[PDB]
Amino acid sequence: HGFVSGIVADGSYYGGYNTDEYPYMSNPPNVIAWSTTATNCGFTNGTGYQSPDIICHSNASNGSNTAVVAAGSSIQFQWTVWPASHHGPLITYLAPCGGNCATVDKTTLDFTKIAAVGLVNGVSPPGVWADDSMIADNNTAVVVIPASYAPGNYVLRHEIIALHVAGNNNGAQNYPQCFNIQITGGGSAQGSGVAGTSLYKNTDPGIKFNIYSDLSGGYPIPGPALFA
Numbered sequence: 452h453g454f455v456s457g458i459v460a461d462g463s464y465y466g467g468y469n470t471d472e473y474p475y476m477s478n479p480p481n482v483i484a485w486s487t488t489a490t491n492c493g494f495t496n497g498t499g500y501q502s503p504d505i506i507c508h509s510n511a512s513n514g515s516n517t518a519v520v521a522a523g524s525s526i527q528f529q530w531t532v533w534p535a536s537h538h539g540p541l542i543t544y545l546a547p548c549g550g551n552c553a554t555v556d557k558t559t560l561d562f563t564k565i566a567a568v569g570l571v572n573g574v575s576p577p578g579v580w581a582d583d584s585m586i587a588d589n590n591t592a593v594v595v596i597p598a599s600y601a602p603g604n605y606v607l608r609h610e611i612i613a614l615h616v617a618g619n620n621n622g623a624q625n626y627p628q629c630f631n632i633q634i635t636g637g638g639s640a641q642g643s644g645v646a647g648t649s650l651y652k653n654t655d656p657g658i659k660f661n662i663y664s665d666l667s668g669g670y671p672i673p674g675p676a677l678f679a
């Protein structure tokens with residue numbers, strides 16, 4: 452599996468939380484990325500959709516730094532690697548920190564879906580998905596912060612849901628990665644957010660989904676509605 456090793460945010464590179472290195476330090480470095488204990492490169496499945504682990508991954512603790520990002524600009528998430536079998540959507544959220552993102556209680560965050568891509572070509576199951584486009588693009592996912600989004604501090608929660616086992620109850624594998632950003636801009640728009648532990652249920656149609664059977668009915672991307 453992969454994790455996000457860094458991001459390019461409004462033109463500038465920020466190193467992420469190197470989960471294969473930083474957990475083995477008594478004094479890990481400051482980063483905009485949240486720490487996790489997911490040293491096995493693992494995931495949170497449906498057994499943890501109501502655990503705080505779903506918010507920013509296993510045992511996640513606040514990143515200490517925050518990246519300044521102009522509204523309307525692009526963020527690129529650099530994943531270390533991604534397996535071809537792990538087809539699924541890429542979903543990205545913003546939750547206001549109401550203060551410094553370095554100290555917000557992650558369980559109080561209310562996430563707004565700002566980007567989501569799912570099934571691209573279902574003609575030949577298991578199909579071609581957003582993560583396959585990410586793989587082709589140097590293992591990099593891309594999102595646009597809405598130009599109209601209200602300035603302030605936000606947790607940016609970027610996630611792949613791998614669906615290779617998702618026909619099973621609790622089979623979908625969620626890979627959330629969180630980063631602190633401060634948006635600047637001239638807009639005032641903000642979505643109505645959803646608590647991390649309310650984003651997904653193991654019975655949801657976009658969670659318990661068989662990618663190996665006929666895909667002509669499409670894929671309903673899970674989670675709350677996309678910000679408009």
Ligand SMILES: [Cu+2]
Nearest residue numbers: 452534537624
């Ligand atoms: Cu796997």
